[PDB]
Amino acid sequence: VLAGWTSLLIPPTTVLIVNLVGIVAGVSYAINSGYQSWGPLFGKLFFAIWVIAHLYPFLKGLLGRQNRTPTIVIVWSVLLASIFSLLWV
Amino acid sequence: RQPMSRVVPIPSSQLTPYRVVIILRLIILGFFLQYRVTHPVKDAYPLWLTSVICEIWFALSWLLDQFPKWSPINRETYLERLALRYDREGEPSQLDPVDVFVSTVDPLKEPPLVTANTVLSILSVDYPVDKVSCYVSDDGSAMLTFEALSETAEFAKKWVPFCKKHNIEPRAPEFYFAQKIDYLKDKIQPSFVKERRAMKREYEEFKVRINALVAKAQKMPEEGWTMQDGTAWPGNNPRDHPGMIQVFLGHSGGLDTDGNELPRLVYVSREKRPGFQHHKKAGAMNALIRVSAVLTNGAYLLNVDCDHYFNNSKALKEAMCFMMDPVIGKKTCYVQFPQRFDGIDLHDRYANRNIVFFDINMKGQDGVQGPVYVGTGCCFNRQALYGYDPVLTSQKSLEKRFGQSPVFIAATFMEQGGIPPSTNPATLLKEAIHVISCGYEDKTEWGKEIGWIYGSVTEDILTGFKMHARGWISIYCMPPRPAFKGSAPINLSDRLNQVLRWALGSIEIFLSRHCPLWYGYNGKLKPLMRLAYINTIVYPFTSIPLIAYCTLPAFCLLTNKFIIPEISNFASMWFILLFVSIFTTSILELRWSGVSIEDWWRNEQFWVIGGTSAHLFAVFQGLLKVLAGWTSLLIPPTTVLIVNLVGIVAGVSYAINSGYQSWGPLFGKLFFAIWVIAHLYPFLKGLLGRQNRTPTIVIVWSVLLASIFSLLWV
Amino acid sequence: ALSETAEFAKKWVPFCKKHNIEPRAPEFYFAQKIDYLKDKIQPSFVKERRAMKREYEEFKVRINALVAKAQKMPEEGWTMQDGTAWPGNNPRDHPGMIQVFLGHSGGLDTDGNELPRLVYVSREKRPGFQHHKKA
């Protein structure tokens, strides 16, 4: 309007990878902290599993039988997730 | 002038990271051993020694297994170029003659129906009728097999023209009619609906006739079997039957419904006498080769098992695309086809497909010199089986090597095949009977340098190694549609029996001569092929470190300490690095090979259980037999399973009694010993569950052995 | 339904006796997906099975037609094929009837032999008396 494939599957891949790596690293860092704070950890554990559960058919479609995922999509998703992870720092 | 077949290297996009993770594995595995040597446990010193020994053996196994798979390749065929070059239209074909060998021993255990289906499938291959022949060899000299072959030949006159006209796939009537897939997919021919109904109604009556013969041949008449002609069956005694040769279909055998001819079918039964060893399959194969040379003298010999049928009718043409090429045909010893099985479970509980072996290891072996001979679905070059050296771009000796039949010696010289003009066809039957006699191989080189090699139950590996030692190379081809399909076992006991047979054969080869280590030092065998042969022969021997590693948990946890020290600087770094890289190479393997994760995981589970169940007994039998001239094969995994389960339960309960703030040891002993149960999970499912096949005596023996172990802990 | 079953038994029974069909019930035997050509020695079995299946399907059609035709009570009561009214028009005031379908003189099957005797028994029921049902 302002100016007169297979990439349609990438943003969920970035969200999936980012959330998975994030929660894993964060729980490990919580183990390193070893604090008596159930509230924050439980809140961040119940959350971000809701996302994976709602993206569970996505994960099954990407990895499993009857796969239809080009390698270029995986490479692009990894690159975008790398930019996001570097942006966090 | 364009190449008949093309070799396609794996793209560098997938190949380069594979080598990068391989070298990274080497660097990070040569340092884990150093870190684990510099940290001995002063309270678990023998246990620490056992763990480090197991790790050393596992690392060496991984290295010698991953070296052959460094440079895999693929092959593609162009059948259109074959049609344009040799299979021209409006002209007799120049295709070399081919002979297909089928071997059977007992019709009682192996039903004649599957053998009849295999014969029908072979007789209906997409090949010229006058350039192909079939030889069926019965080791037991069975009357039922003879009549089954006769009925199969009678039914072939109706089955073959229908398949040729309507392009029926597969050619086996049983498997074709059993398919539930829509048969009206691309059938252009109008007169196909009516013919299919009649052909099905005729196959059902053929099955009825076969069943009637099988039912009638369950007891031996006291006066012996009598043929339809009236003369008694010569093979009344399976040990004193003289050699018989019978031809069913051929030039003068008869005409089919369309008036054409059919490929020649020959029934061969060798002469057996008491007091002489016949070597079973190897002797039968040698007899078949000699008889085929005398009768038809085919250029190439394709070996097909009785339970394997042609799923693709153009397998012979694809093989000829490799063997008949002038540049890669004068140095090719055999072409190996992948083995596929049907009628199996969707999950493939018993891992009968062998995905990893047949789509990863075979390609890596083909990358250097070619795949190893594995039995069924192999097309051999006739000149290679005679011990002749490859070409790369004497009467006394001939009689000593081959035999005392001048017809076979003369037929040897025919490198392109076909009956020599000097040899009159009037006396081609008496000479064949002369060769089939049991006193032919005496004082000859058969079974030592020429043809199949004796001295092993798994006598296929030795033959391939002997052929490769002379400088020959083999070709691995993968058609889009599998060329051969067989019936896989559906029993844990049967699968373990065949694994035990293979491992025992490898051990028997290792202790005897003709090994890759002390034999083959001629300078023509590539070192990487030597490594692959060494791995295939040795991999029995890795069982003892494996069972020690799987016996570690209960013995360690019932006592104190562990194989691991406290986590500190540089301590857990190597742990995570090794674990991550171990999981890292797997995804690249699946990526380039195309193997699903479930298949690889199932192969890992089978590797563990077969490492226990069959391999220690293979080593034990070989060692004891060499130094000294059922259902127990399932016991050691049962002892390991029970010992580990009871151990971890008691140890965690004792940890509850202690109630200490030590997460490290408990977590280490909890994550471990669940790995063992997970890798033995199909074992637990097989023992306890539906379709149980566990005798009570096995359970009693396992309980007794576990009781001795538990009392030994105290 | 019993009359039609007796009519069809003259064709079903000899086939089962000759070819050792298991189970004897046509519905469950034909509904099995297991390979029926397991141990059938008899040569004239493939042709007979097709005809027997094509006859059982028509028997099922006839039974379905009878069931569909017997969903409503005619206002004048049911009438048999002979013409006489059905005695059991009222399920509570029906006098006892006994009818024999197959037997010694009932008829011969396709092979000319006989069939086991089949008897249809309906007891007499009157109002004001307990019948104890199955007992």
Author numbering:
A (entry chain B): 950 to 953, 979 to 1063
B (entry chain A): 261 to 653, 718 to 953, 979 to 1063
C (entry chain C): 408 to 542
Sentences from the study reporting this entry:
Cellulose is synthesized by cellulose synthase (CesA), a membrane-integrated processive family-2 glycosyltransferase. The enzyme synthesizes cellulose from UDP-activated glucose (UDP-Glc) and translocates the polymer across the plasma membrane through a channel formed by its own membrane-spanning segment. Cryo-EM analyses of all three CesA isoforms reveal the formation of homotrimeric complexes, similar to the secondary cell wall CesAs.
The CSR has been proposed to be intrinsically disordered and only its short N- and C-terminal helical segments are visible in the cryo-EM maps. For GmCesA1, however, at lower contour levels, additional CSR density is evident, extending from corners of the catalytic domains of the GmCesA1 trimer. At this position, the CSR’s N-terminal conserved cysteine residue(s) postulated to be acylated reside near the membrane interface. Between the different isoforms, GmCesA1 exhibits greatest product accumulation. In contrast, the activities of GmCesA1 and GmCesA6 peak at pH 8, with a slight decline at pH 9. The apparent Vmax value is ~eightfold higher for GmCesA1 compared to GmCesA3. GmCesA1’s apparent IC50 for UDP is about 0.8 mM, whereas this concentration is increased to about 1.3–1.5 mM for GmCesA6 and GmCesA3, respectively.
